[PDB]
Amino acid sequence: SMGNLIKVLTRDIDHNASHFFLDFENAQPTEAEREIFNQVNVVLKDAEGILNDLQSYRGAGHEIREAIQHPNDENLQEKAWSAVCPLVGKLKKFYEFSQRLEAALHGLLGALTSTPYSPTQHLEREQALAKQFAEILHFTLRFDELKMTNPAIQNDFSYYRRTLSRMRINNENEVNNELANRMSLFYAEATPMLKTLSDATTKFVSDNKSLPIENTTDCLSTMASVCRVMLETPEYRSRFASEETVSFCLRVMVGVIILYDHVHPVGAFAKTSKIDMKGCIKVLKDQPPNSVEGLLNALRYTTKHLNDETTSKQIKTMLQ
Secondary structure, three states: OHHHHHHHHOOOOOOOOOOOOOOHHHHOOOOOOHHHHHHHHHHHHHHHHHHHHHHOOOOOHHHHHHHHHOOOOHHHHHHHHHHHHHHHHHHHHHHHHHHHHHHHHHHHHHHHOOOOOOHHHHHHHOHHHHHHHHHHHHHHHHHHHHHHHOOHHHHHHHHHHHHHHOOOOOOOOOOOHHHHHHHHHHHOOOOHHHHHHHHHHHHHHHHOOOOOOHHHHHHHHHHHHHHHHHHHOHHHHHHHOOHHHHHHHHHHHHHHHHHHHHHOOOOOOOOOOOOOHHHHHHHHHOOOHHHOHHHHHHHHHOOOOOOOOOOOHHHHHHOO
């Protein structure tokens, strides 16, 4: 049922572009999925506004550089402050939305990693939740791809913190030092949303001591192979691979690979791993470079076991 797993994960997304929530009537969640599907779909619904606010993040680099150049001109200091404050408000909204992804992820993992059923049976029984999990990873990579290309995010927040301290000594919606420290560590990450999801998955394995870790890791590796097989077999490429479906599974694949590398003890590159690392990197390399470079850079730096001595030198050359 490799073909069925592909149709389940890639259903109603060709006729659906740039939407992360699932239509309740179209997804058809079972009675056991209803309470989790509704809660996660509320987060996925708000995920569109988060991504559009990041696409519209213009930055305040122009006003900041003029204020730094003329530091005694209070009009330029107030103009830069008036431009950076609503941008910091967006950054505060992005970080708080990352906390909502952790709550929705626990509900999905708790249902997709039940004790008796296998990973393949879970993705077929809980189709609506399995589809929601892929949408969370789809938004996660798409958010981080934009953040990696926008250097004004860290520059605007760093200027905000420096100005706030030397403005709260000289002369409600403001950001306290405790929240600012967590936000600074959040945006210092290469993939902030993916690092957040990676820690939440490690938390889920830790919170369920009586649950075998394979129920979680083999769930990630199953989804990775579903996307890899469809993208590398022309018999499935001529049947499902569209620009919307390819870009969807490219980001789902890289997402579960990085989660698997942080959760599985030996990592995603070791000889006991279940991820076909060579096959996954090849799929990314066979794509136009401009639409994958953000995903490749995630594998070069965000990963945990890439630079290990156990990791094959063959894939290290692929990732160069």
